[PDB]
Structure formats: C-alpha cells, structure tokens
mmCIF file with all atom_site columns, N, CA and C and ligand atoms in Angstrom:
data_model
loop_
_atom_site.group_PDB
_atom_site.id
_atom_site.type_symbol
_atom_site.label_atom_id
_atom_site.label_alt_id
_atom_site.label_comp_id
_atom_site.label_asym_id
_atom_site.label_entity_id
_atom_site.label_seq_id
_atom_site.pdbx_PDB_ins_code
_atom_site.Cartn_x
_atom_site.Cartn_y
_atom_site.Cartn_z
_atom_site.occupancy
_atom_site.B_iso_or_equiv
_atom_site.pdbx_formal_charge
_atom_site.auth_seq_id
_atom_site.auth_comp_id
_atom_site.auth_asym_id
_atom_site.auth_atom_id
_atom_site.pdbx_PDB_model_num
ATOM   1   N  N   . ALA A 1 1  ? 0.860  -1.230 0.000  1.00 0.00 ? 1  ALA A N   1
ATOM   2   C  CA  . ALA A 1 1  ? 0.000  0.000  0.000  1.00 0.00 ? 1  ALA A CA  1
ATOM   3   C  C   . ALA A 1 1  ? 0.882  1.261  0.000  1.00 0.00 ? 1  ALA A C   1
ATOM   4   N  N   . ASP A 1 2  ? 0.696  2.103  -1.015 1.00 0.00 ? 2  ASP A N   1
ATOM   5   C  CA  . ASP A 1 2  ? 1.418  3.372  -1.060 1.00 0.00 ? 2  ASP A CA  1
ATOM   6   C  C   . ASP A 1 2  ? 1.084  4.197  0.179  1.00 0.00 ? 2  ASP A C   1
ATOM   7   N  N   . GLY A 1 3  ? 2.114  4.739  0.826  1.00 0.00 ? 3  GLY A N   1
ATOM   8   C  CA  . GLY A 1 3  ? 1.932  5.646  1.935  1.00 0.00 ? 3  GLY A CA  1
ATOM   9   C  C   . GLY A 1 3  ? 1.764  4.992  3.290  1.00 0.00 ? 3  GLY A C   1
ATOM   10  N  N   . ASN A 1 4  ? 1.940  3.669  3.373  1.00 0.00 ? 4  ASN A N   1
ATOM   11  C  CA  . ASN A 1 4  ? 1.640  2.914  4.576  1.00 0.00 ? 4  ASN A CA  1
ATOM   12  C  C   . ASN A 1 4  ? 2.569  3.312  5.711  1.00 0.00 ? 4  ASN A C   1
ATOM   13  N  N   . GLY A 1 5  ? 3.876  3.320  5.431  1.00 0.00 ? 5  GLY A N   1
ATOM   14  C  CA  . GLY A 1 5  ? 4.854  3.647  6.460  1.00 0.00 ? 5  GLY A CA  1
ATOM   15  C  C   . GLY A 1 5  ? 4.664  5.044  7.009  1.00 0.00 ? 5  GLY A C   1
ATOM   16  N  N   . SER A 1 6  ? 4.498  6.029  6.118  1.00 0.00 ? 6  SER A N   1
ATOM   17  C  CA  . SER A 1 6  ? 4.304  7.401  6.570  1.00 0.00 ? 6  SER A CA  1
ATOM   18  C  C   . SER A 1 6  ? 3.011  7.566  7.361  1.00 0.00 ? 6  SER A C   1
ATOM   19  N  N   . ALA A 1 7  ? 1.922  6.899  6.938  1.00 0.00 ? 7  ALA A N   1
ATOM   20  C  CA  . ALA A 1 7  ? 0.658  7.000  7.672  1.00 0.00 ? 7  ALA A CA  1
ATOM   21  C  C   . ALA A 1 7  ? 0.767  6.375  9.062  1.00 0.00 ? 7  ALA A C   1
ATOM   22  N  N   . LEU A 1 8  ? 1.407  5.204  9.139  1.00 0.00 ? 8  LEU A N   1
ATOM   23  C  CA  . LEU A 1 8  ? 1.645  4.538  10.399 1.00 0.00 ? 8  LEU A CA  1
ATOM   24  C  C   . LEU A 1 8  ? 2.455  5.428  11.330 1.00 0.00 ? 8  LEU A C   1
ATOM   25  N  N   . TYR A 1 9  ? 3.515  6.035  10.792 1.00 0.00 ? 9  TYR A N   1
ATOM   26  C  CA  . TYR A 1 9  ? 4.341  6.924  11.590 1.00 0.00 ? 9  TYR A CA  1
ATOM   27  C  C   . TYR A 1 9  ? 3.538  8.126  12.069 1.00 0.00 ? 9  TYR A C   1
ATOM   28  N  N   . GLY A 1 10 ? 2.734  8.710  11.188 1.00 0.00 ? 10 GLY A N   1
ATOM   29  C  CA  . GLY A 1 10 ? 1.923  9.850  11.588 1.00 0.00 ? 10 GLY A CA  1
ATOM   30  C  C   . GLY A 1 10 ? 0.915  9.519  12.673 1.00 0.00 ? 10 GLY A C   1
ATOM   31  N  N   . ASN A 1 11 ? 0.372  8.302  12.661 1.00 0.00 ? 11 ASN A N   1
ATOM   32  C  CA  . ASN A 1 11 ? -0.618 7.932  13.660 1.00 0.00 ? 11 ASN A CA  1
ATOM   33  C  C   . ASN A 1 11 ? 0.000  7.472  14.982 1.00 0.00 ? 11 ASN A C   1
ATOM   34  N  N   . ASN A 1 12 ? 1.237  6.952  14.965 1.00 0.00 ? 12 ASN A N   1
ATOM   35  C  CA  . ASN A 1 12 ? 1.814  6.277  16.125 1.00 0.00 ? 12 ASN A CA  1
ATOM   36  C  C   . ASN A 1 12 ? 3.091  6.908  16.679 1.00 0.00 ? 12 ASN A C   1
ATOM   37  N  N   . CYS A 1 13 ? 3.763  7.788  15.932 1.00 0.00 ? 13 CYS A N   1
ATOM   38  C  CA  . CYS A 1 13 ? 5.084  8.248  16.352 1.00 0.00 ? 13 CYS A CA  1
ATOM   39  C  C   . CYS A 1 13 ? 5.220  9.769  16.427 1.00 0.00 ? 13 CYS A C   1
ATOM   40  N  N   . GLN A 1 14 ? 4.529  10.450 15.524 1.00 0.00 ? 14 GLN A N   1
ATOM   41  C  CA  . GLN A 1 14 ? 4.836  11.844 15.212 1.00 0.00 ? 14 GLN A CA  1
ATOM   42  C  C   . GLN A 1 14 ? 4.564  12.764 16.390 1.00 0.00 ? 14 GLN A C   1
ATOM   43  N  N   . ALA A 1 15 ? 3.572  12.422 17.212 1.00 0.00 ? 15 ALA A N   1
ATOM   44  C  CA  . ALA A 1 15 ? 3.207  13.266 18.344 1.00 0.00 ? 15 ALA A CA  1
ATOM   45  C  C   . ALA A 1 15 ? 4.397  13.524 19.254 1.00 0.00 ? 15 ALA A C   1
ATOM   46  N  N   . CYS A 1 16 ? 5.317  12.548 19.376 1.00 0.00 ? 16 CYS A N   1
ATOM   47  C  CA  . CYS A 1 16 ? 6.481  12.654 20.249 1.00 0.00 ? 16 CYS A CA  1
ATOM   48  C  C   . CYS A 1 16 ? 7.811  12.863 19.538 1.00 0.00 ? 16 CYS A C   1
ATOM   49  N  N   . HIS A 1 17 ? 7.930  12.486 18.261 1.00 0.00 ? 17 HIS A N   1
ATOM   50  C  CA  . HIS A 1 17 ? 9.202  12.492 17.536 1.00 0.00 ? 17 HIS A CA  1
ATOM   51  C  C   . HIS A 1 17 ? 9.265  13.512 16.412 1.00 0.00 ? 17 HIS A C   1
ATOM   52  N  N   . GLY A 1 18 ? 8.171  14.227 16.126 1.00 0.00 ? 18 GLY A N   1
ATOM   53  C  CA  . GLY A 1 18 ? 8.102  15.101 14.967 1.00 0.00 ? 18 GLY A CA  1
ATOM   54  C  C   . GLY A 1 18 ? 7.576  14.421 13.703 1.00 0.00 ? 18 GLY A C   1
ATOM   55  N  N   . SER A 1 19 ? 7.226  15.249 12.712 1.00 0.00 ? 19 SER A N   1
ATOM   56  C  CA  . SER A 1 19 ? 6.830  14.728 11.400 1.00 0.00 ? 19 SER A CA  1
ATOM   57  C  C   . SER A 1 19 ? 7.964  13.884 10.826 1.00 0.00 ? 19 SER A C   1
ATOM   58  N  N   . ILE A 1 20 ? 7.611  13.005 9.887  1.00 0.00 ? 20 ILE A N   1
ATOM   59  C  CA  . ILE A 1 20 ? 8.585  12.018 9.455  1.00 0.00 ? 20 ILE A CA  1
ATOM   60  C  C   . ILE A 1 20 ? 9.748  12.680 8.727  1.00 0.00 ? 20 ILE A C   1
ATOM   61  N  N   . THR A 1 21 ? 9.522  13.815 8.059  1.00 0.00 ? 21 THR A N   1
ATOM   62  C  CA  . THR A 1 21 ? 10.631 14.439 7.338  1.00 0.00 ? 21 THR A CA  1
ATOM   63  C  C   . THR A 1 21 ? 11.515 15.251 8.276  1.00 0.00 ? 21 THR A C   1
ATOM   64  N  N   . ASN A 1 22 ? 11.020 15.548 9.480  1.00 0.00 ? 22 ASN A N   1
ATOM   65  C  CA  . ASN A 1 22 ? 11.744 16.254 10.521 1.00 0.00 ? 22 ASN A CA  1
ATOM   66  C  C   . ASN A 1 22 ? 11.768 15.431 11.815 1.00 0.00 ? 22 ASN A C   1
ATOM   67  N  N   . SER A 1 23 ? 12.004 14.122 11.702 1.00 0.00 ? 23 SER A N   1
ATOM   68  C  CA  . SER A 1 23 ? 11.964 13.247 12.869 1.00 0.00 ? 23 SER A CA  1
ATOM   69  C  C   . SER A 1 23 ? 13.275 13.306 13.647 1.00 0.00 ? 23 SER A C   1
ATOM   70  N  N   . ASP A 1 24 ? 13.172 13.181 14.971 1.00 0.00 ? 24 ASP A N   1
ATOM   71  C  CA  . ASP A 1 24 ? 14.366 13.186 15.800 1.00 0.00 ? 24 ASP A CA  1
ATOM   72  C  C   . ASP A 1 24 ? 14.894 11.784 16.096 1.00 0.00 ? 24 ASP A C   1
ATOM   73  N  N   . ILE A 1 25 ? 14.347 10.759 15.452 1.00 0.00 ? 25 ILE A N   1
ATOM   74  C  CA  . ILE A 1 25 ? 14.792 9.388  15.690 1.00 0.00 ? 25 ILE A CA  1
ATOM   75  C  C   . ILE A 1 25 ? 16.157 9.158  15.059 1.00 0.00 ? 25 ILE A C   1
ATOM   76  N  N   . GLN A 1 26 ? 17.047 8.516  15.819 1.00 0.00 ? 26 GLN A N   1
ATOM   77  C  CA  . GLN A 1 26 ? 18.383 8.231  15.318 1.00 0.00 ? 26 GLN A CA  1
ATOM   78  C  C   . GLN A 1 26 ? 18.449 6.910  14.555 1.00 0.00 ? 26 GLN A C   1
ATOM   79  N  N   . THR A 1 27 ? 18.085 5.825  15.194 1.00 0.00 ? 27 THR A N   1
ATOM   80  C  CA  . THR A 1 27 ? 18.356 4.501  14.638 1.00 0.00 ? 27 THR A CA  1
ATOM   81  C  C   . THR A 1 27 ? 17.048 3.997  14.041 1.00 0.00 ? 27 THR A C   1
ATOM   82  N  N   . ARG A 1 28 ? 16.988 4.065  12.719 1.00 0.00 ? 28 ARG A N   1
ATOM   83  C  CA  . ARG A 1 28 ? 15.757 3.866  11.966 1.00 0.00 ? 28 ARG A CA  1
ATOM   84  C  C   . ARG A 1 28 ? 15.685 2.435  11.439 1.00 0.00 ? 28 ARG A C   1
ATOM   85  N  N   . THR A 1 29 ? 15.649 1.506  12.388 1.00 0.00 ? 29 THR A N   1
ATOM   86  C  CA  . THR A 1 29 ? 15.617 0.083  12.090 1.00 0.00 ? 29 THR A CA  1
ATOM   87  C  C   . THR A 1 29 ? 14.528 -0.580 12.924 1.00 0.00 ? 29 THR A C   1
ATOM   88  N  N   . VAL A 1 30 ? 14.067 -1.740 12.446 1.00 0.00 ? 30 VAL A N   1
ATOM   89  C  CA  . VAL A 1 30 ? 13.071 -2.521 13.191 1.00 0.00 ? 30 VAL A CA  1
ATOM   90  C  C   . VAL A 1 30 ? 13.593 -2.879 14.579 1.00 0.00 ? 30 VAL A C   1
ATOM   91  N  N   . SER A 1 31 ? 14.846 -3.346 14.659 1.00 0.00 ? 31 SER A N   1
ATOM   92  C  CA  . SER A 1 31 ? 15.349 -3.788 15.963 1.00 0.00 ? 31 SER A CA  1
ATOM   93  C  C   . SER A 1 31 ? 15.418 -2.628 16.940 1.00 0.00 ? 31 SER A C   1
ATOM   94  N  N   . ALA A 1 32 ? 15.806 -1.450 16.446 1.00 0.00 ? 32 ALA A N   1
ATOM   95  C  CA  . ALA A 1 32 ? 15.880 -0.266 17.300 1.00 0.00 ? 32 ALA A CA  1
ATOM   96  C  C   . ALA A 1 32 ? 14.497 0.130  17.801 1.00 0.00 ? 32 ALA A C   1
ATOM   97  N  N   . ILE A 1 33 ? 13.503 0.097  16.924 1.00 0.00 ? 33 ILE A N   1
ATOM   98  C  CA  . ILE A 1 33 ? 12.152 0.454  17.333 1.00 0.00 ? 33 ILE A CA  1
ATOM   99  C  C   . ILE A 1 33 ? 11.621 -0.577 18.315 1.00 0.00 ? 33 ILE A C   1
ATOM   100 N  N   . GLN A 1 34 ? 11.861 -1.854 18.040 1.00 0.00 ? 34 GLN A N   1
ATOM   101 C  CA  . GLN A 1 34 ? 11.335 -2.875 18.940 1.00 0.00 ? 34 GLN A CA  1
ATOM   102 C  C   . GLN A 1 34 ? 12.014 -2.780 20.302 1.00 0.00 ? 34 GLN A C   1
ATOM   103 N  N   . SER A 1 35 ? 13.306 -2.490 20.306 1.00 0.00 ? 35 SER A N   1
ATOM   104 C  CA  . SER A 1 35 ? 14.025 -2.328 21.570 1.00 0.00 ? 35 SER A CA  1
ATOM   105 C  C   . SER A 1 35 ? 13.473 -1.161 22.381 1.00 0.00 ? 35 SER A C   1
ATOM   106 N  N   . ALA A 1 36 ? 13.212 -0.025 21.730 1.00 0.00 ? 36 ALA A N   1
ATOM   107 C  CA  . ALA A 1 36 ? 12.611 1.096  22.444 1.00 0.00 ? 36 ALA A CA  1
ATOM   108 C  C   . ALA A 1 36 ? 11.225 0.756  22.990 1.00 0.00 ? 36 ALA A C   1
ATOM   109 N  N   . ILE A 1 37 ? 10.399 0.045  22.216 1.00 0.00 ? 37 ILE A N   1
ATOM   110 C  CA  . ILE A 1 37 ? 9.107  -0.382 22.745 1.00 0.00 ? 37 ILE A CA  1
ATOM   111 C  C   . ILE A 1 37 ? 9.314  -1.261 23.974 1.00 0.00 ? 37 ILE A C   1
ATOM   112 N  N   . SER A 1 38 ? 10.164 -2.293 23.852 1.00 0.00 ? 38 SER A N   1
ATOM   113 C  CA  . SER A 1 38 ? 10.329 -3.253 24.928 1.00 0.00 ? 38 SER A CA  1
ATOM   114 C  C   . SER A 1 38 ? 10.884 -2.611 26.195 1.00 0.00 ? 38 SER A C   1
ATOM   115 N  N   . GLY A 1 39 ? 11.732 -1.581 26.063 1.00 0.00 ? 39 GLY A N   1
ATOM   116 C  CA  . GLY A 1 39 ? 12.301 -0.832 27.167 1.00 0.00 ? 39 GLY A CA  1
ATOM   117 C  C   . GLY A 1 39 ? 11.425 0.323  27.636 1.00 0.00 ? 39 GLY A C   1
ATOM   118 N  N   . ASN A 1 40 ? 10.267 0.520  26.997 1.00 0.00 ? 40 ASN A N   1
ATOM   119 C  CA  . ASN A 1 40 ? 9.312  1.558  27.390 1.00 0.00 ? 40 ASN A CA  1
ATOM   120 C  C   . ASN A 1 40 ? 9.977  2.915  27.366 1.00 0.00 ? 40 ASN A C   1
ATOM   121 N  N   . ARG A 1 41 ? 10.912 3.126  26.430 1.00 0.00 ? 41 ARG A N   1
ATOM   122 C  CA  . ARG A 1 41 ? 11.531 4.427  26.352 1.00 0.00 ? 41 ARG A CA  1
ATOM   123 C  C   . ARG A 1 41 ? 10.442 5.411  25.994 1.00 0.00 ? 41 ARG A C   1
ATOM   124 N  N   . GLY A 1 42 ? 10.331 6.452  26.802 1.00 0.00 ? 42 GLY A N   1
ATOM   125 C  CA  . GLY A 1 42 ? 9.359  7.492  26.537 1.00 0.00 ? 42 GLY A CA  1
ATOM   126 C  C   . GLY A 1 42 ? 7.918  7.050  26.683 1.00 0.00 ? 42 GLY A C   1
ATOM   127 N  N   . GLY A 1 43 ? 7.679  5.928  27.360 1.00 0.00 ? 43 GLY A N   1
ATOM   128 C  CA  . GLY A 1 43 ? 6.353  5.359  27.436 1.00 0.00 ? 43 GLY A CA  1
ATOM   129 C  C   . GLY A 1 43 ? 5.892  4.577  26.216 1.00 0.00 ? 43 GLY A C   1
ATOM   130 N  N   . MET A 1 44 ? 6.805  4.198  25.298 1.00 0.00 ? 44 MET A N   1
ATOM   131 C  CA  . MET A 1 44 ? 6.446  3.551  24.013 1.00 0.00 ? 44 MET A CA  1
ATOM   132 C  C   . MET A 1 44 ? 5.933  2.114  24.184 1.00 0.00 ? 44 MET A C   1
ATOM   133 N  N   . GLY A 1 45 ? 5.975  1.557  25.415 1.00 0.00 ? 45 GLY A N   1
ATOM   134 C  CA  . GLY A 1 45 ? 5.511  0.185  25.598 1.00 0.00 ? 45 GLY A CA  1
ATOM   135 C  C   . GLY A 1 45 ? 4.100  -0.066 25.092 1.00 0.00 ? 45 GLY A C   1
ATOM   136 N  N   . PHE A 1 46 ? 3.273  0.978  25.019 1.00 0.00 ? 46 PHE A N   1
ATOM   137 C  CA  . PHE A 1 46 ? 1.914  0.819  24.504 1.00 0.00 ? 46 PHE A CA  1
ATOM   138 C  C   . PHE A 1 46 ? 1.898  0.413  23.027 1.00 0.00 ? 46 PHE A C   1
ATOM   139 N  N   . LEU A 1 47 ? 2.994  0.607  22.313 1.00 0.00 ? 47 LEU A N   1
ATOM   140 C  CA  . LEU A 1 47 ? 3.095  0.300  20.886 1.00 0.00 ? 47 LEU A CA  1
ATOM   141 C  C   . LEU A 1 47 ? 3.350  -1.178 20.619 1.00 0.00 ? 47 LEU A C   1
ATOM   142 N  N   . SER A 1 48 ? 3.248  -2.017 21.653 1.00 0.00 ? 48 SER A N   1
ATOM   143 C  CA  . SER A 1 48 ? 3.261  -3.461 21.447 1.00 0.00 ? 48 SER A CA  1
ATOM   144 C  C   . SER A 1 48 ? 2.182  -3.931 20.473 1.00 0.00 ? 48 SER A C   1
ATOM   145 N  N   . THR A 1 49 ? 1.193  -3.090 20.180 1.00 0.00 ? 49 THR A N   1
ATOM   146 C  CA  . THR A 1 49 ? 0.108  -3.416 19.242 1.00 0.00 ? 49 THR A CA  1
ATOM   147 C  C   . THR A 1 49 ? 0.531  -3.411 17.777 1.00 0.00 ? 49 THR A C   1
ATOM   148 N  N   . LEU A 1 50 ? 1.695  -2.843 17.461 1.00 0.00 ? 50 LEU A N   1
ATOM   149 C  CA  . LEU A 1 50 ? 2.175  -2.834 16.097 1.00 0.00 ? 50 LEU A CA  1
ATOM   150 C  C   . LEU A 1 50 ? 2.675  -4.215 15.683 1.00 0.00 ? 50 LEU A C   1
ATOM   151 N  N   . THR A 1 51 ? 2.289  -4.656 14.483 1.00 0.00 ? 51 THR A N   1
ATOM   152 C  CA  . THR A 1 51 ? 2.874  -5.870 13.917 1.00 0.00 ? 51 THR A CA  1
ATOM   153 C  C   . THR A 1 51 ? 4.301  -5.612 13.414 1.00 0.00 ? 51 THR A C   1
ATOM   154 N  N   . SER A 1 52 ? 5.028  -6.709 13.178 1.00 0.00 ? 52 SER A N   1
ATOM   155 C  CA  . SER A 1 52 ? 6.367  -6.604 12.619 1.00 0.00 ? 52 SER A CA  1
ATOM   156 C  C   . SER A 1 52 ? 6.352  -6.010 11.226 1.00 0.00 ? 52 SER A C   1
ATOM   157 N  N   . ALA A 1 53 ? 5.310  -6.301 10.446 1.00 0.00 ? 53 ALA A N   1
ATOM   158 C  CA  . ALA A 1 53 ? 5.197  -5.686 9.140  1.00 0.00 ? 53 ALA A CA  1
ATOM   159 C  C   . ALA A 1 53 ? 5.027  -4.180 9.265  1.00 0.00 ? 53 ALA A C   1
ATOM   160 N  N   . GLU A 1 54 ? 4.261  -3.732 10.259 1.00 0.00 ? 54 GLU A N   1
ATOM   161 C  CA  . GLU A 1 54 ? 4.055  -2.293 10.418 1.00 0.00 ? 54 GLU A CA  1
ATOM   162 C  C   . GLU A 1 54 ? 5.342  -1.605 10.888 1.00 0.00 ? 54 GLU A C   1
ATOM   163 N  N   . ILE A 1 55 ? 6.089  -2.225 11.800 1.00 0.00 ? 55 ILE A N   1
ATOM   164 C  CA  . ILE A 1 55 ? 7.356  -1.610 12.217 1.00 0.00 ? 55 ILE A CA  1
ATOM   165 C  C   . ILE A 1 55 ? 8.335  -1.547 11.033 1.00 0.00 ? 55 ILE A C   1
ATOM   166 N  N   . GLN A 1 56 ? 8.374  -2.606 10.218 1.00 0.00 ? 56 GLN A N   1
ATOM   167 C  CA  . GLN A 1 56 ? 9.163  -2.572 8.996  1.00 0.00 ? 56 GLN A CA  1
ATOM   168 C  C   . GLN A 1 56 ? 8.781  -1.373 8.134  1.00 0.00 ? 56 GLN A C   1
ATOM   169 N  N   . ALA A 1 57 ? 7.477  -1.193 7.912  1.00 0.00 ? 57 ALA A N   1
ATOM   170 C  CA  . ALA A 1 57 ? 7.026  -0.103 7.042  1.00 0.00 ? 57 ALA A CA  1
ATOM   171 C  C   . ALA A 1 57 ? 7.427  1.260  7.614  1.00 0.00 ? 57 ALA A C   1
ATOM   172 N  N   . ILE A 1 58 ? 7.355  1.423  8.942  1.00 0.00 ? 58 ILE A N   1
ATOM   173 C  CA  . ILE A 1 58 ? 7.762  2.674  9.580  1.00 0.00 ? 58 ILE A CA  1
ATOM   174 C  C   . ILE A 1 58 ? 9.266  2.901  9.428  1.00 0.00 ? 58 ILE A C   1
ATOM   175 N  N   . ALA A 1 59 ? 10.061 1.865  9.719  1.00 0.00 ? 59 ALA A N   1
ATOM   176 C  CA  . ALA A 1 59 ? 11.507 1.988  9.629  1.00 0.00 ? 59 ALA A CA  1
ATOM   177 C  C   . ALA A 1 59 ? 11.950 2.300  8.202  1.00 0.00 ? 59 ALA A C   1
ATOM   178 N  N   . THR A 1 60 ? 11.331 1.642  7.215  1.00 0.00 ? 60 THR A N   1
ATOM   179 C  CA  . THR A 1 60 ? 11.688 1.898  5.818  1.00 0.00 ? 60 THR A CA  1
ATOM   180 C  C   . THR A 1 60 ? 11.386 3.342  5.450  1.00 0.00 ? 60 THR A C   1
ATOM   181 N  N   . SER A 1 61 ? 10.205 3.816  5.841  1.00 0.00 ? 61 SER A N   1
ATOM   182 C  CA  . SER A 1 61 ? 9.821  5.190  5.550  1.00 0.00 ? 61 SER A CA  1
ATOM   183 C  C   . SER A 1 61 ? 10.775 6.170  6.222  1.00 0.00 ? 61 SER A C   1
ATOM   184 N  N   . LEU A 1 62 ? 11.082 5.945  7.512  1.00 0.00 ? 62 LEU A N   1
ATOM   185 C  CA  . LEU A 1 62 ? 12.029 6.813  8.219  1.00 0.00 ? 62 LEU A CA  1
ATOM   186 C  C   . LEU A 1 62 ? 13.393 6.842  7.533  1.00 0.00 ? 62 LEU A C   1
ATOM   187 N  N   . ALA A 1 63 ? 13.903 5.671  7.159  1.00 0.00 ? 63 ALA A N   1
ATOM   188 C  CA  . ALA A 1 63 ? 15.228 5.595  6.570  1.00 0.00 ? 63 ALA A CA  1
ATOM   189 C  C   . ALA A 1 63 ? 15.262 6.322  5.235  1.00 0.00 ? 63 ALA A C   1
ATOM   190 N  N   . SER A 1 64 ? 14.154 6.299  4.497  1.00 0.00 ? 64 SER A N   1
ATOM   191 C  CA  . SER A 1 64 ? 14.059 6.976  3.213  1.00 0.00 ? 64 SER A CA  1
ATOM   192 C  C   . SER A 1 64 ? 13.928 8.482  3.364  1.00 0.00 ? 64 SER A C   1
ATOM   193 N  N   . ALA A 1 65 ? 13.528 8.967  4.535  1.00 0.00 ? 65 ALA A N   1
ATOM   194 C  CA  . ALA A 1 65 ? 13.297 10.396 4.693  1.00 0.00 ? 65 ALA A CA  1
ATOM   195 C  C   . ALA A 1 65 ? 14.606 11.114 5.012  1.00 0.00 ? 65 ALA A C   1
ATOM   196 N  N   . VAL A 1 66 ? 15.668 10.348 5.250  1.00 0.00 ? 66 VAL A N   1
ATOM   197 C  CA  . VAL A 1 66 ? 16.981 10.934 5.504  1.00 0.00 ? 66 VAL A CA  1
HETATM 198 C  C1  . HEC B 2 .  ? 5.786  9.576  23.212 1.00 0.00 ? 1  HEC B C1  1
HETATM 199 C  C2  . HEC B 2 .  ? 4.700  8.863  24.028 1.00 0.00 ? 1  HEC B C2  1
HETATM 200 C  C3  . HEC B 2 .  ? 6.489  8.694  22.153 1.00 0.00 ? 1  HEC B C3  1
HETATM 201 C  C4  . HEC B 2 .  ? 5.930  8.003  21.137 1.00 0.00 ? 1  HEC B C4  1
HETATM 202 C  C5  . HEC B 2 .  ? 4.445  7.883  20.753 1.00 0.00 ? 1  HEC B C5  1
HETATM 203 C  C6  . HEC B 2 .  ? 6.983  7.387  20.357 1.00 0.00 ? 1  HEC B C6  1
HETATM 204 N  N1  . HEC B 2 .  ? 8.194  7.720  20.947 1.00 0.00 ? 1  HEC B N1  1
HETATM 205 FE FE1 . HEC B 2 .  ? 9.915  6.762  20.399 1.00 0.00 ? 1  HEC B FE1 1
HETATM 206 N  N2  . HEC B 2 .  ? 10.827 7.577  22.072 1.00 0.00 ? 1  HEC B N2  1
HETATM 207 C  C7  . HEC B 2 .  ? 10.231 8.538  22.861 1.00 0.00 ? 1  HEC B C7  1
HETATM 208 C  C8  . HEC B 2 .  ? 11.193 8.943  23.875 1.00 0.00 ? 1  HEC B C8  1
HETATM 209 C  C9  . HEC B 2 .  ? 10.921 9.985  24.939 1.00 0.00 ? 1  HEC B C9  1
HETATM 210 C  C10 . HEC B 2 .  ? 12.455 8.150  23.599 1.00 0.00 ? 1  HEC B C10 1
HETATM 211 C  C11 . HEC B 2 .  ? 13.785 8.224  24.387 1.00 0.00 ? 1  HEC B C11 1
HETATM 212 C  C12 . HEC B 2 .  ? 14.708 9.346  23.996 1.00 0.00 ? 1  HEC B C12 1
HETATM 213 C  C13 . HEC B 2 .  ? 15.720 9.431  25.139 1.00 0.00 ? 1  HEC B C13 1
HETATM 214 O  O1  . HEC B 2 .  ? 16.079 10.557 25.565 1.00 0.00 ? 1  HEC B O1  1
HETATM 215 O  O2  . HEC B 2 .  ? 16.142 8.348  25.645 1.00 0.00 ? 1  HEC B O2  1
HETATM 216 C  C14 . HEC B 2 .  ? 12.142 7.343  22.431 1.00 0.00 ? 1  HEC B C14 1
HETATM 217 C  C15 . HEC B 2 .  ? 12.983 6.465  21.834 1.00 0.00 ? 1  HEC B C15 1
HETATM 218 C  C16 . HEC B 2 .  ? 12.842 5.950  20.565 1.00 0.00 ? 1  HEC B C16 1
HETATM 219 C  C17 . HEC B 2 .  ? 13.907 5.307  19.814 1.00 0.00 ? 1  HEC B C17 1
HETATM 220 C  C18 . HEC B 2 .  ? 15.370 5.135  20.306 1.00 0.00 ? 1  HEC B C18 1
HETATM 221 C  C19 . HEC B 2 .  ? 16.109 6.451  20.240 1.00 0.00 ? 1  HEC B C19 1
HETATM 222 C  C20 . HEC B 2 .  ? 16.522 6.821  18.815 1.00 0.00 ? 1  HEC B C20 1
HETATM 223 O  O3  . HEC B 2 .  ? 17.078 5.977  18.065 1.00 0.00 ? 1  HEC B O3  1
HETATM 224 O  O4  . HEC B 2 .  ? 16.282 7.972  18.423 1.00 0.00 ? 1  HEC B O4  1
HETATM 225 C  C21 . HEC B 2 .  ? 13.408 4.922  18.643 1.00 0.00 ? 1  HEC B C21 1
HETATM 226 C  C22 . HEC B 2 .  ? 14.159 4.196  17.500 1.00 0.00 ? 1  HEC B C22 1
HETATM 227 C  C23 . HEC B 2 .  ? 12.012 5.315  18.615 1.00 0.00 ? 1  HEC B C23 1
HETATM 228 N  N3  . HEC B 2 .  ? 11.668 5.919  19.801 1.00 0.00 ? 1  HEC B N3  1
HETATM 229 C  C24 . HEC B 2 .  ? 11.098 5.099  17.620 1.00 0.00 ? 1  HEC B C24 1
HETATM 230 C  C25 . HEC B 2 .  ? 9.763  5.364  17.755 1.00 0.00 ? 1  HEC B C25 1
HETATM 231 C  C26 . HEC B 2 .  ? 8.783  4.925  16.799 1.00 0.00 ? 1  HEC B C26 1
HETATM 232 C  C27 . HEC B 2 .  ? 9.160  4.232  15.481 1.00 0.00 ? 1  HEC B C27 1
HETATM 233 C  C28 . HEC B 2 .  ? 7.592  5.361  17.204 1.00 0.00 ? 1  HEC B C28 1
HETATM 234 C  C29 . HEC B 2 .  ? 6.248  5.161  16.515 1.00 0.00 ? 1  HEC B C29 1
HETATM 235 C  C30 . HEC B 2 .  ? 6.014  3.649  16.294 1.00 0.00 ? 1  HEC B C30 1
HETATM 236 C  C31 . HEC B 2 .  ? 7.765  6.023  18.487 1.00 0.00 ? 1  HEC B C31 1
HETATM 237 N  N4  . HEC B 2 .  ? 9.083  6.012  18.761 1.00 0.00 ? 1  HEC B N4  1
HETATM 238 C  C32 . HEC B 2 .  ? 6.792  6.618  19.229 1.00 0.00 ? 1  HEC B C32 1
HETATM 239 C  C33 . HEC B 2 .  ? 8.944  9.001  22.844 1.00 0.00 ? 1  HEC B C33 1
HETATM 240 C  C34 . HEC B 2 .  ? 7.927  8.501  22.044 1.00 0.00 ? 1  HEC B C34 1
#
C-alpha cells in the first residue's frame, strides 16, 4: 500500500518524535524500534500493538526520509 509507512508513523510516532521528514529518531531500524518499545523508552511500551510488518514499514519510511 502506497503511503503505509508514513501513515503509520503519523498515527503512532509523530506526536512525540516530529513529522517524518523532521523526525528526531536516530536509529531507523526494526530492531531499534522494537528495543525502544520493549524498554518503554518514553512510554512507548503501549506500541506493542504494532505488527512486525508495520514496524518494517515505519523503519523503511524513516530511513528513506533521511
Ligand atoms: C511519546 C509517548 C512517544 C511516542 C508515541 C513514540 N516515541 Fe519513540 N521515544 C520517545 C522517547 C521519549 C524516547 C527516548 C529518547 C531518550 O532521551 O532516551 C524514544 C525512543 C525511541 C527510539 C530510540 C532512540 C533513537 O534511536 O532515536 C526509537 C528508535 C524510537 N523511539 C522510535 C519510535 C517509533 C518508530 C515510534 C512510533 C512507532 C515512536 N518512537 C513513538 C517518545 C515517544
């Protein structure tokens, strides 16, 4: 689906990290995102609801922005 990663990021990340083209995230990988969720960095533990496909789509979009 065109726009999936950016839409996911806008709904789940942007409130705390900025818009995707101006994001403050450093490590734009699935493992980095999953580690932050698991460690509840910034309260992100609630994002356990994301599938692995969705985290992939977010990380790909972030890495492409950039
Ligand atoms: C506020 C409730 C947040 C939401 C929603 C998301 N993030 Fe987050 N994240 C937040 C904080 C306060 C921190 C810690 C920064 C610090 O000073 O330690 C983080 C951490 C990350 C990280 C690791 C740090 C980095 O590489 O920049 C990543 C990779 C990350 N967060 C990604 C991320 C994603 C993909 C989100 C949407 C699924 C997301 N965060 C939401 C605060 C909040």
